[PDB]
């Protein structure tokens, strides 16, 4: 176990415990999720009795607002979701009109 030559640790790992190994993964993973264009699904539990067919609505309500489902529905309406470009028209729609 060394402290020098790039004055640090080198063989085996560095001085990287299990936490450091996992943290290295935890970094790349999170950074790489940011590297992409996400699309989401949000799913709701019906009742806590593991019962099919039945649904409780207090249970939905409590889930909805805390996950900000309303705000998502509110921003999708208010916003302008796709910031694209002009030239896209003139070329492709010469065929059209």
């Amino acid at each position: 176990p060394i402290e020098k030559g790039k004055g640090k640790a080198k063989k085996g790992s560095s001085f990287q415990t299990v936490s450091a190994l996992h943290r290295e993964n935890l970094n790349k993973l999170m950074t790489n999720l940011r590297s992409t264009h996400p699309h989401f699904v949000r799913c709701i539990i019906p009742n806590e009795t593991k019962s099919p067919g039945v649904m409780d609505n207090p249970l939905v309500m409590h889930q909805l607002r805390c996950n900000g489902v309303l705000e998502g529905i509110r921003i999708c309406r208010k916003g302008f979701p796709n910031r694209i470009l002009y030239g896209d028209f003139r070329q492709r729609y010469r065929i059209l009109n």
Binding site: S35, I84, L85, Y86, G87, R90
Partner: protein, 97 residues
């Protein structure tokens, strides 16, 4: 002994190198990632090429960056793009001649 097409074709590719210099990026200091104020400037380029007009006007500012071997995205800061577009027209000319 040029074909009747190729007459216009060589002029098409050659003339864009005048057109490209028009793309006037403008400072919007909230990050410095400028997007150019117009479309006609780069459309007169696009049409003469028949490259995907959407691919053009988007990709110029936000391209897929090869990072090591994987893929990330980025907006280019103002001057980075301004010069990088000027690179494009001179890139066509070296190749065309």
């Amino acid at each position: 002994g040029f074909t009747s097409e190729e007459k216009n074709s060589m002029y098409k590719l050659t003339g864009a190198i005048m057109h490209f210099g028009n793309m006037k990026f403008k400072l919007k200091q909230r990050e410095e990632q400028a997007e150019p104020d117009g479309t006609e400037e780069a459309d007169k380029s696009a049409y003469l090429m028949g490259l995907n007009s959407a691919d053009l006007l988007k990709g110029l500012c936000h391209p897929r960056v090869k990072v090591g071997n994987e893929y990330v995205t980025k907006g280019q800061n103002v001057q980075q793009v301004i010069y990088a577009t000027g690179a494009l027209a001179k890139a066509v000319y070296e190749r065309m001649f």
